[PDB]
C-alpha cells in the first residue's frame, strides 16, 4: 500500500453526470433512519463512502424534536458506503458537531470536533487510534471543512477556524502526518473570513473554495503549498458569484482580491474549481434562500476580474425544491483525476413547519467528458406523509 500523491492531470470535463442519491427522508417515513445534516462524501482508493453528522436520534423518534441546532454532545460522525442510507447499523466513527475525513492511501484520517463552544477539542483519529488533539485557540467555536481534507505523499491538510461568525476570525491550516499534527500555518493573503472549505488536490498543492460569512457573496480561495506550508488566499474572480445571500447576476461583482461587500453576511458551504482560466461551479438557484441548485462553466471565471460569460449550465435540483450545503470530492481515475460534488437537500424546520425535526438527504454527481441530458433530482419526501 502506498501513499496517494495525486499527480495526474485534472480530467477535462464537459459537465456532470448523475452518480448517487440515498433517499434518506422518503425512507424515514417507513424505516429507522438517522437524523443528520452537513453530509459529505469522501473516497478511499477502491470505493466511495458517504458521511454526515447525526443528531444522535432517528427521525421517527421523539428525540428528533428541535434538531435545528447545530451543536449538541450527541452528534457523531456517521460513515457508510456511498448509497447505503444511515440505518441503525451504521457506524458512529467519532463524537463531532464539525468534521473532515480523508484517506491518505494507507488509512482514514477523521478530525472530529465536540465540546463546549467556548472550549472545544478537536480529535485526530487515524487508522482507528486517537493520535492527537488540539483545543480551541480563540475560544469561539473551533470549526472545520464539513467535507473532505486531502493528503499528498503522507501529509493531510485541513483548514479550521475559531473566532467570530460575522466578524474577524482566526484561521489556521494544519498539516498532519499519520494523525499527528506536524505544522500549523496561519492564513495569509487577502481572504477576510474563511469557513467551511471545499478543498481539492491540485498537485503539488491543494486549493480550497470556502465560505465568507462576514463581508462576501463571492467565495474565498485558500492556496496551500504542501512543500513550504505557505498559505495564500484571494476570492474567485467570477462576477457570477456562488454564495447565498448573493445580489443577482446583474448587480454582482468580484475583483479576485477583496470581499465584494454585496450581501456579505451569512452564507452556505459551496465549491468551485478551476479549469485553465475557466471556472466550474455550483450555487443555489435562489439568491436568498437555499433552494434549487445549478452548475455551470464561467468562461474566464478563474482569471478575469468579474467575468460573467456562462455556458454548459445544468439544473441539478429545480428551484422549487430545497438544497443546502455542497462540496467537492476527487476520485483518482485511470489517466486523470476527476472532480465530483454532493448537494445536501435539507428538510424540516425552520423552513417547513409541519414537522419538528430538521434532516437532509443527498444527491451526488460526478464530472464527465461524455454527453448528458437534463433532469432535476430533489429530495422527494412529501412533507405531509412524514412523522412530525
Amino acid at each position: 500500500v502506498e501513499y496517494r500523491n495525486w499527480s495526474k492531470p485534472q480530467c477535462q470535463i464537459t459537465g456532470f453526470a448523475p452518480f448517487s442519491k440515498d433517499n434518506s427522508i422518503r425512507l424515514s417515513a417507513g424505516g429507522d433512519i438517522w437524523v443528520t445534516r452537513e453530509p459529505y462524501v469522501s473516497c478511499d482508493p477502491v470505493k466511495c463512502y458517504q458521511f454526515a453528522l447525526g443528531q444522535g436520534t432517528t427521525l421517527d423518534n421523539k428525540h428528533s424534536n428541535d434538531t435545528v441546532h447545530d451543536r449538541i454532545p450527541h452528534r457523531t460522525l456517521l460513515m457508510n458506503e456511498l448509497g447505503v442510507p444511515f440505518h441503525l447499523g451504521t457506524r458512529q466513527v467519532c463524537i463531532a458537531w464539525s468534521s473532515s475525513s480523508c484517506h491518505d492511501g494507507k488509512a482514514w484520517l477523521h478530525v472530529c470536533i465536540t465540546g463546549d463552544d467556548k472550549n472545544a477539542t478537536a480529535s485526530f483519529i487515524y487508522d482507528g487510534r486517537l493520535v492527537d488533539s488540539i483545543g480551541s485557540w480563540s475560544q469561539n467555536i473551533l470549526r472545520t471543512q464539513e467535507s473532505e481534507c486531502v493528503c499528498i505523499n503522507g501529509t493531510c491538510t485541513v483548514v479550521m477556524t475559531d473566532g467570530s461568525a460575522s466578524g474577524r476570525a482566526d484561521t489556521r491550516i494544519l498539516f498532519i502526518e499519520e494523525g499527528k499534527i506536524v505544522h500549523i500555518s496561519p492564513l495569509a493573503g487577502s481572504a477576510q473570513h474563511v469557513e467551511e472549505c471545499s478543498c481539492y488536490p491540485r498537485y503539488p498543492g491543494v486549493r480550497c473554495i470556502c465560505r465568507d460569512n462576514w463581508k462576501g457573496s463571492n467565495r474565498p480561495v485558500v492556496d496551500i503549498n504542501m512543500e513550504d506550508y505557505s498559505i495564500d488566499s484571494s476570492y474567485v474572480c467570477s462576477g457570477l458569484v456562488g454564495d447565498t445571500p448573493r445580489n443577482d447576476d446583474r448587480s454582482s461583482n468580484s475583483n479576485c482580491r477583496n470581499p465584494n461587500n454585496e450581501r456579505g453576511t451569512q452564507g452556505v458551504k459551496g465549491w468551485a474549481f478551476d479549469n485553465g482560466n475557466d471556472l466550474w461551479m455550483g450555487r443555489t438557484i435562489s439568491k436568498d434562500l437555499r433552494s434549487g441548485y445549478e452548475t455551470f462553466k464561467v468562461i474566464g471565471g478563474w482569471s478575469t476580474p468579474n467575468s460573467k460569460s456562462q455556458i454548459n449550465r445544468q439544473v441539478i435540483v429545480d428551484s422549487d425544491n430545497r438544497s443546502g450545503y455542497s462540496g467537492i470530492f476527487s476520485v483518482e481515475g485511470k489517466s486523470c483525476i476527476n472532480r465530483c460534488f454532493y448537494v445536501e437537500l435539507i428538510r424540516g424546520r425552520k423552513q417547513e413547519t409541519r414537522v419538528w425535526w430538521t434532516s437532509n438527504s443527498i444527491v451526488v454527481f460526478c464530472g464527465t467528458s461524455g454527453t448528458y441530458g437534463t433532469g432535476s433530482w430533489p429530495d422527494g419526501a412529501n412533507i405531509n406523509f412524514m412523522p412530525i
Copy 2:
C-alpha cells in the same frame, strides 16, 4: 485477476432446478422492505447478486402510493447477495429507472439511466468510479436491458434503444472497455423493434432475445460479433412464441425473419436460448396477462420456421398466480457454462386494487443436467394482510 472470456461449452441441460426465492412481499407486511420492480440477478466469478430498480421508498411507508409509474428521479439500482432481501441496509449503486450491470472478471459495470424522458443521460460506472456518459439520441426515453450485460475479454456490450415504444425506434449496441464507451453499432438485420434484451455469452459472440413492442408476439434475436462489432438480428423460429400478448399455440406463427404481426403491440421482457436446433424458453402461462410462468424445450425451435414440438415442460408459477419480467444469467461452471433465469412476480396495482403500491418479489431457477420433479413457487403474499 483476469478477464472473463466465457469460452466453455454451454452445459447440456435436462431442464431447470429451484435456485432462490427472496420473498420480499410476504416480509414487507412485517419488516421495512424496499418497493421495487424490473429485478434481475447477475453474477461475479465467486458469487451471485440480485438487483432491482427501487422506487425510493419501503412498502409500509406512505410514499409507496402510486408506485405503478416506471420513471421518477428517486429510483435507484439496489444490489445485494442473491437471497438477502432489500432491507434498509441495501446499497443504492446509482440513480436509474433503467439499468444493466455485468462483471468482466475484474470489476462490476453498471449502466444506469435517469433523467427526463425527452433528454435522459446514461452513466457508465465501472469499479466504483463514473467513467463515461451518453445523452439521449432520439429524445424519447433512452432505455436498456433490465438484466445483465455480458463482457468477453475486457469488452462489455449492452444494447440500448431510444425512440417510439410502439413504432420505429433507434437501437444501438455499445461496446465498452473499463467503463469507457469504445464503439457504438446500430442495429442491423431484420428485427423491427428491440426493447429489454436478455443477452448471454455464446463465445465468441453474445446473443440476445428481446422484446418487440410494436409488431410481434415472436421475440427478436440480436447477434453481436465481438470482433467486428457487427450486429445481425432475426426472430426466434419457434412457432410456440414467447411474448405476452400472444395468440395461442394453435394460431401462432413465426418465420424466423419478420414480426409475426399476431398481437404485436406491447410485450414483456423475456428470455430463450438455443441448444443445437432446439430452443429452451419460458413465457407467461396466460397469453393475455402476466400470470403463471412455464419453461420448455421446442424441438427444432431454433432452426425450423414455425417448429411447435414441445417437450420437458415445467410449471414454475402456476397460472393462478402473478409473474412478470424474466431474464437470463450465465454462471461459469467447472467444465461448461450454465444458463439460469429469474422470474419477477409483481404484486399490487394495477391488477390488484386493495393496495396502492406496486412491487415485485423474485424466484430463480438454474439449468441442471440431473433430475427434478414438479412444483409451483409463487410470490405468496396474501393481499388482504398487506399494508395498503
Copy 3:
C-alpha cells in the same frame, strides 16, 4: 486451501459447556425476526454458522398464522454467523423445506429440497453454483438430515429417504464431490426406518444416529464406508433410549439390532455419539412430549445390549420448558476433533394456543474436558407478551 479429512482423535470429554443461544423468540416481540423451525449449526474451518428453514415471514407479520405446516413453497434455508439472529438482512441460501449443509474445507455444500410432496427435487448447490439435482425416487416426500452432512477428502455424504413416514421407506446415502452426485448407495444392515440423521466424522467413516419413525424408541445407527460406499446399520445398544415417545427407563429396551417396538411410531430428530464402549447422548426429559432436554454418558451404552448405567448427566433445558429437534456438529480442534450439539426450543402452536404461529429459538453446547456446573437455559419468551 485443502480438503478437510478429519483424521484426529475424538477429544475426550467430561460433559458439555454452554456455547451459544440466539434468543430469537424474546427478540421477535420487539424486532423483525424470521419465523423458523428445523435449525442446525454447521461450521466451516474458521467459524461457525447457524442455519434454519424459514417460513418466508417474520413473526410480527400476519403471514405467520398457521406456520405449523412443515412444507410450503416459501420456506428457504437461512444462514448466519452463530449468534447473530435471523433478522431481515439474513441470506436465504436456497429454496427448501428440508436441508443439509456442510463445508468440505474449500466451499459450502447445501442440499435443499422443495417441491411437491409427491414429486420433490433436491438441488445440490456447491460454492454458490447449482451443480446437480435429483427427483423423488419413491414419490413420497424426499427428505434429509436437517443438520450437517460431513465431507472427508473431497467427498461429502448425505443420507436422504423417500417413502412412508410410518411404514417401510426407501433410504439412499449419496456421495457427492464438488456438488456433483458421484455414487448413491441404498441402506443396508438392520435399521427399519431412517429419518433425520445426525451424522459425524469418525475417520475413515462417518456415523449417523437417526430417527426411527415407524417401530422404534431406540435410534438407528447408519455406518458409511467412505472408501467402498458400503452402508451398514444397527440400533444404539443403550437400554436408556433416546427417541420421544419412549417407554421410561424402567421398561425400555434395545438389543443393538432391531427396533425395540416400544412406542415406535413418531419421533424427533436426535443425536448420540460413541466413546469407546460408552455413549454420550441427549434426549428430551419427557418421554411423551418434546419438553426439557438432558445429556449423559451411558457406561457400556455403545456396546452392551441394554446397558443402562448412566453417569455425568446435565440438564440443558428443565422439564418445564419446551425443547425440540437436536443434532450434532463437529469442530476440528488443535489436537482432537470435538463434538457439539444444538437443541431447538420450539414455541407456538400446537402446544401453546395463545398465538397462531410456530417458531423456535436455539441454545448450543460444546463438549469440554474441563469442569462445569449446573443451569437450565430455555427459550425465555413469555407467551403473554408475544404478538399473536
Copy 4:
C-alpha cells in the same frame, strides 16, 4: 500474524480527548436496540470493538420489564465495531452474565460465565471454538472482570472471584494459552476483596485496579508476574480514592496497604493507572450515587500514602447526569501504548421510575499528549420520551 507482547513505553499523556459515544438509549425510542449493561470495549490490532452483556431483549419489547437483575440465562455477550450500536443484527458471541474478552495478536479470547449462582461454569472460547471450561470453586457466583483481559506473548490472564460479595471471597488469576487454562494462581499480598478488575499491560506484567466490595472505598491493585505467575496486591495510595460510596476528599484516606474502612461495602467497577509516582484516574462525581464522572492526575497518587494533590481534572459527564461502570483499555500506538477508558451511562430502574427497564449507553475517551478543552457528554435520552 504474531503475538502481541506489548513492550513499548506507556505514552505520556496530558489528559483525555473524546473518542466515541454510541447513543443506544436515544436511539431505542425509535429503533430496535438491545437492552444491555456492563459494557466494555476491547481492541484487536487493527480496530476496536465495543462489548456488553445483553438482557436477551430489545428495549421497546415487553420482555425488557425488570431487567434490573444481573443474572438470567438469556444474557449473552454482544460484540460490534466501536460505534455501531447494538441493533438486531449484532452477534451474541457466547452465553454470559459476566465476561472478559481480549485479543492476543492472533485471535480473540472470550471467557463467558453463565449458570446457577451456586454452580456456574465459565467457558473459554478461543478463535471461535470452545477450548476449556471451569466450574465454580466456592459455589457462590463465579464472576470476572467485565472489561478486557490482557495477553503478552501468547498467554492471556484473567482474574475471577467466587465467594461472598461483602465478606471474604476466593480470587484466582488464570493464565491461558490459546483458550486452554495453563496455570491458576491464588491471590496474594494485601487486598481484602477483589471484584471487577480493570487490567492493563505494563510490560512484563499486567496491573489491575479492582473493586473492593467489602471494606474499602480505596481500590485494590493486583500485580501479575507473567513469568513466575506470582500475584502481589495492595491498594492505590491516592488519598483521593475512587470507589463509590466513598467519604469525600476532606475525610478520605488510603495507606497503600489495607482497605481504608471508609464506606467500604458496595462499590462500582472503576480504573486508574500509574505514571511514575503519579496516578491518572476517574471516579463518579457523586460520592454516594453513580452520577457524573471526572478524571484527574494525583501528584504522588501512585507512591505516597495519602497524596491528595490533584491537577488536570476534566468533567466527562456532569454531576447532574448518570454514569456507571468504567474500565480501561490499551491501544498499541506507533511508539508508545496508550490508555483509554469507557464510562457506562446507565438509565432506567431503580433510580428512574417512569420506565420498567434498565439499560446503559456508552461514551469513551482516549489519552492524548496534545491539548483539549471542556465539555460534558451524557447519555442524552429524555426519560419522558422512552417506551416504558
